[PDB]
Design an enzyme around this catalytic site. Structure first.
Site, mmCIF file in Angstrom:
data_model
loop_
_atom_site.group_PDB
_atom_site.id
_atom_site.type_symbol
_atom_site.label_atom_id
_atom_site.label_comp_id
_atom_site.label_asym_id
_atom_site.label_seq_id
_atom_site.Cartn_x
_atom_site.Cartn_y
_atom_site.Cartn_z
ATOM 1 N N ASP A 270 0.997 -1.309 0.017
ATOM 2 C CA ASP A 270 -0.141 -0.071 0.193
ATOM 3 C C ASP A 270 1.249 1.173 0.088
ATOM 4 O OD1 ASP A 270 -2.522 1.401 0.256
ATOM 5 O OD2 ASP A 270 -1.421 1.625 2.335
ATOM 6 N N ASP B 53 -0.446 5.009 0.883
ATOM 7 C CA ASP B 53 -1.100 5.581 2.079
ATOM 8 C C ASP B 53 -0.822 5.262 3.038
ATOM 9 O OD1 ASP B 53 -0.739 8.301 0.774
ATOM 10 O OD2 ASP B 53 -3.442 7.606 0.391
HETATM 11 MG MG LIG Z 1 -2.952 3.077 3.617
#
Ligand SMILES: [Mg+2]
Ligand SMILES: [Mg+2]
Ligand SMILES: [Mg+2]
Ligand SMILES: [Mg+2]
Lengths: 474, 474, 474, 474
Positions: B50, B52
């Site tokens: 991922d 963020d």
């Molecule tokens: Mg995230």
């Protein structure tokens, strides 16, 4: 010596209520209550019960075999082949909690994460690399309820075996051609899914429309464990709190079974007047429809206990003596008994419908009865050298960072598992815990082979479990 | 010294890849990878990320405060009162994972079973007996998603504080009359639910339609942690497996952020040519829509990386160099990388959308990043005498079977919790574990303050956790 | 002289197939096919039939009375009061197509727009201003299926009367207190909705689990209209197209009924060898589950016609001689008969399940059988002076722009309606058309008292209806 | 001379309210109100209005062309090819009410039963036998909303043309390969469905996020019909009943448009003081969200008319002067105006959202505005010899029982249809009525080219339609 044989042997013993005798007795694994989360019994104000396989434990393998026979007979009546009649229930095959995969016709034993521990197609146990073709990640998504059915009740034991019998029969019967998703009989295709659905429908039919209940009640001694300590425990509970029954069964069946369970020439203790079963309960609720019971439930109805029929209309009145309820919801219990969820200990055998749902939906305290535990414990203790070897092997292999002596780990795993049956322990395959084990630990605050084990602890007892720490806290 | 200050301090250190230095370094809690279930790194063939709060960790409290300010400004623009503009983000109030109760306007900290650990109405911390009026069983049914919202992402920290600010403001503002389920302003009634929905909508608006991204990218040094060891770790991963990005963000934002994360005058190690961020990934997928990604997903699209727009139509071609994907599903990854779930380590911060769903739906191996852990660990160690006293007190109280010195247990519990903030530790209140803690243990195979901690273990490392035993097995 | 008496009188007449005799005969309303949309019979390649109340018309009021008696007996068996046993079916009360309002316990006759034409509470006919209290706009939203049940099948005639009987009984029985939404019997509240559901369940039970079918087949002459012209019409159809049966009934019942319908000492015409019923059909499909049949349907199965049981598995083979199908879908018919929808004339009595759904879902041509029409037509003709007066009165009132002689319009409306029964004509109340009438016009391309009326037109006949013009086109 | 040219010509005429002048004027088709079901105007107590294409009729083809241009520009901005910019709106192609088939990319004109009247693929009109390949029964199931989209609003005219433009462009552009369900551009596949969805999204975007409203309000004379008789009619209505506005548009847009619609140097009649638009309404409701409005609706909110923003909270107060409502439901209207459904005449242009839903869900009386009727009527009258020939031909062919002179029926059908445009009349193709025509007749009690035509009848007028008789009643 089945698990019910263990239970009935313990049932025949009268209660010695001398406090030193009790403390000695509960120390033994068989008479012990096991603890997943701490529970101060002193805070329990209501004790609630399920009936089937909780108060009324059906004898094994006789009850499973009756269920099997009648289910087979039903399938044959709707047009399955006559060869089904030569099947015979075999208690050594099924373990509870297996998953039937309706796409490929396999019984699967899985861990809490859906990883495959065992895969059987009929009676063929499919080894690791062979399972990859159908299960490339050796994994199922168990919440795919269109595909997977979890056989987690004791009522599911006969169908667990029957599914395997059927797959084996069709596979080896030359009239049919085996295909990946079912069987071809000329211009008819029987998918494993349609086969599974017919079996499910037949089991339901046997219980609700067929002769199972009739045959059970005409020979209750053959089919139902009976224990004179039951009224002793329930009368003790009534001295410190309220007692209730919430069962999915109907009034007529409940009455026959409960009457039998209390049929001794005495009440709570030897020498005391017999009292009717109903007198042990502050509230009796039948047709509960758990687990829907623990959400919206159904409308509250009153049983005409004379006819065994429901009175017409919704019951709007108060709790009164001699009233029997039908339907309703868990809120009916709380409201009528003046209880909050954490004041309630609910005692049942259904890991999903009784224990998980009451805990998650309402915050009830939970006691899971696990009938097979009476025999699993004997195997666990008798064969503990096997498990310890498996532990030392796992340690030794990990410390190594001659690794092909992990086939020794496979061999010991197989030998251990076979001591329990063809589908191994309810709780593990070798060093890997089953889904069922994980559910027990997560949702059953307390568990035992029988709820009767509560008799051996005082009602002020504090059941203790160690606090859990995260790895970074340890 | 915020959790991001800890992370950025560690980020400024160059990597000493001497193997003795590495073994010394990971022994320290801060640089350690913690293990809930054993994981043989040697079996991982794909490392997935991922973006963020995983690769791009936003600096605290600056990023939360920007999010807060813009959300407030949006509410005022749609007609909330001007007094909102005098609010200011306070990092000492919110802890992640709290539940907003939309019926009564309370922030709740709960354990894994929905039992109330803390209840705040605005900034008023409601003590035990006071909470019973609204929560008779000190329990919520957390899956009641019409009523309860679990604030479990780092993006939810500003709204967590803002909800409390709002409840406090309306309660104390004489223009409004406080009612059980909201506020009365003459002929207008603002329910806590409608208020909550306005806040949720404003947070979403700020992220998707407002200026948050713009303001972030114009000052990336202020808002984003940067670490020259990132390309070192990713290049190491690429030597032993494949590397992928699966992010909910769009291509344009991803490109700005990732470009910044790799903007050093060198590539993997000091002295090496800089390489573009994209060259570290065998597969790049944006607009992932996790957690829907881990079920049906969405149609697979291709990004025109020149315009940052999607090409028209579904992408039907193969994996090729320089292609950027949009949408799709977790099966796209498996298929294009030739991987099974257990060959994949997916690294993210979203306990639900990244970790729980990838584990449950696909059987992926999981690494949870917990940014706050960098500071929680410092508190845990600095204040461990407090926790040990609490343990000894719990022991002593249980052995007792002078009990009103369990107010000492309340006091020490409060003092410990306050060291973390007004809403206590992410992981516990006193000796009781939070829902979040329980989810971490159950679904994160590995976890750490940063994924960078993987750099300190060789790729053949066997991460070990003890086997779990049932109480009757122990 | 019931509607079935009319039908059986016509049934006893042998067919005169002289073409002049046929043209004379169909001119009479009773032997006529009525046309809502033009239909070139020459384009019909398949004639499809329903069984119950289409081929097998049950005799009235005997069949309704049997249904009534057994439904009452079932209610009493589940605990309704003994007084129900003194009810007796009354054919003069119910008209088909009424709406039971489960909130207030009323039978409603409505127009196509849901406007109230008649409202009865038990046997009390509620006049206009009185209905406003419960129906402020003299309107119901008929698609509110939680509240309103449309009794639009001939099987619903007994329950239509029984609902009224029950409301009347409970209202006038001093043990119960009448309330707006049901009845109070101390601590029991019976809502009209629960009462309605018990009745629906009992009707279903009687048909599927009870003795209705058994009692029907043991006296078929008493219960079923029989007509030697049936095989003549079907053999004629087979000369110009294909013929099929698609019925919701099971094979065993279908076989008993159909065998009776063809039990003459001759085949198509007098003097010809008898042929089995099955020989008249190119395709026979039972357990059709209309209207689900006209969407996804169910899996296609094959009947073992020897046992009357289903063969195990899905039937994957072709259309062959002597095969009997079960389940499937309307696509099964099209595929196996090589037909498109507009090549099919489907003949049935169920305005929703047969006619509306086949038209809307598949574009089939439709022939609606309306058994009561045989008697409604006699009333329409015998009392046409009443309707014409009502027309002239409506004209005269509108031209007036002495208006309180519109009570004359109410009086003539009542007198006309009473000629049909207490609930008036199937097709109208005074000058206002019913919902049922409107559905007939919109979805039945052709309609008649019996499908036998097709015998009187050649198979090349062009049935004509006038083109419709919009008001601005007229 | 577009339909809006007709309307604006009529709009420029001052009202002669001499009663003989009125009676003469309404006799003309253009100024007439047409009647599907009788309606006594004297019983109407509330007159309700929609805004867009009811009170505010957008000028044609200018408004459609603006909508088209901006939609194209949006598609190009998200990455459609530059060639789209050379498209130009063509008012002669689209007729309202066509069905886009997303599987095969066709525009279909259908009758009320889903029978194909016209099928165009791009600009290729597919003749009868050619359509059979894709539509074997020349029939669609129009309630298949996953596949079929009914373009039945005037806002849908630009997208109706744009869909055809796109299909034509991709088909003839050599970069793409035409396939049955869309277009192949190497490794990208654009299905007609995804293409359709992009167009729908772009139209929505233009209306809600783009510049359409801005460009409309900066040149209202170019884009909006204006008629000084509007306030005269509304003031007359207010003398005999109550008047309301229920529009899906927001307050700010509504205010700009309505202000323009009332911007004359006079009020109701020439010489009278101007009054603000709001003064003509007893109730004003914006953001109505029809058709959801006619079921549950949304929470009732109050507009701050100074800012054009919603006040925070649900509005719980009474109807007062100057209040503007937002959201709510049709029950809000009934309750606040003290009206029942049949006391309400609701006036709008949306055959589904305004007229069908208000009639079916609430029993409101309905007046459908059909803007194109102003020009369709001129064609109907100018070309009536063509329609009469078609009628005589249909008669003659049917009486015949030289039939290949039914190609004459095809030819005259084509010539008639082309007078209206490439997709023919809104109301028919030759002698076959469209779905739209049938919906108008079934749900619009009254209809007209403009609601202004009500001005020409007194408020006591009884609008009459003939009673409907069934074929067996005729
Ligand atoms: Mg995230
Ligand atoms: Mg049980
Ligand atoms: Mg029928
Ligand atoms: Mg409109």
């Amino acid at each position: 010596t089945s698990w019910s044989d263990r239970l009935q042997n313990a049932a025949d013993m009268p209660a010695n209520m001398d406090k030193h005798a009790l403390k000695k007795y509960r120390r033994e694994a068989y008479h012990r209550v096991f603890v997943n989360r701490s529970l101060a019994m002193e805070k329990i104000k209501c004790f609630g019960f399920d009936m089937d396989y909780t108060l009324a434990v059906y004898k094994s393998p006789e009850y499973e075999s009756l269920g099997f026979e009648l289910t087979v007979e039903r399938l044959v009546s709707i047009g399955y082949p006559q060869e089904l009649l030569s099947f015979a229930y075999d208690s050594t095959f099924p373990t509870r909690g297996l998953v039937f995969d309706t796409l490929y016709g396999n019984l699967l034993k899985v861990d809490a994460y859906g990883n495959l521990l065992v895969c059987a197609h009929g009676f063929n146990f499919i080894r690791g690399p062979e399972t990859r073709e159908q299960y490339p990640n050796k994994f199922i998504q168990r919440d795919d309820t269109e595909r997977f059915y979890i056989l987690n009740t004791l009522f599911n034991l006969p169908e667990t075996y029957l599914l395997a019998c059927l797959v084996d029969f069709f596979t080896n019967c030359p009239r049919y051609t085996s295909c990946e998703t079912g069987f071809k009989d000329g211009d008819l295709f029987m998918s494993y899914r349609s086969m599974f659905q017919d079996v499910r429908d037949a089991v339901d039919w046997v219980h609700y429309k067929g002769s199972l209940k009739e045959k059970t009640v005409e020979n209750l001694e053959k089919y139902v464990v009976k224990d004179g300590k039951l009224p002793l425990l329930l009368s003790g509970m009534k001295e410190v709190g309220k007692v209730f029954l919430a069962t999915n069964s109907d009034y007529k069946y409940t009455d026959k079974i409960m009457t039998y369970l209390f049929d001794f020439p005495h009440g709570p203790k030897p020498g005391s007047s017999h009292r009717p079963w109903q007198s042990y309960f502050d509230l009796i609720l039948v047709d509960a429809r758990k687990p829907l019971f623990f959400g919206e439930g159904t409308v509250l109805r009153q049983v005409d206990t004379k006819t065994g029929k429901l009175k017409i209309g919704t019951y709007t009145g108060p709790l009164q003596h001699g009233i029997v309820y039908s339907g309703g919801s868990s809120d009916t219990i709380c409201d009528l008994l003046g209880a909050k969820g954490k004041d309630i200990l609910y005692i049942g055998d259904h890991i999903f419908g009784d224990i998980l749902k009451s805990k998650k939906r309402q915050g009830w305290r939970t006691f899971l009865v696990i009938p097979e535990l009476a025999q699993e414990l004997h195997v666990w203790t008798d064969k503990s050298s096997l498990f310890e070897e498996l532990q030392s092997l796992d340690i030794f292999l990990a410390e190594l960072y001659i690794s092909s002596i992990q086939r020794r780990i496979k061999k010991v795993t197989h030998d251990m598992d076979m001591c329990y049956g063809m589908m191994g322990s309810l709780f593990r395959s070798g060093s890997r815990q089953t889904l069922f084990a994980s559910q027990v630990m997560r949702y059953a605050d307390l568990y035992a082979a029988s709820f009767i084990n509560l008799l051996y602890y005082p009602f002020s007892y504090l059941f203790r479990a160690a606090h859990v720490l995260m790895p970074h806290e340890s």
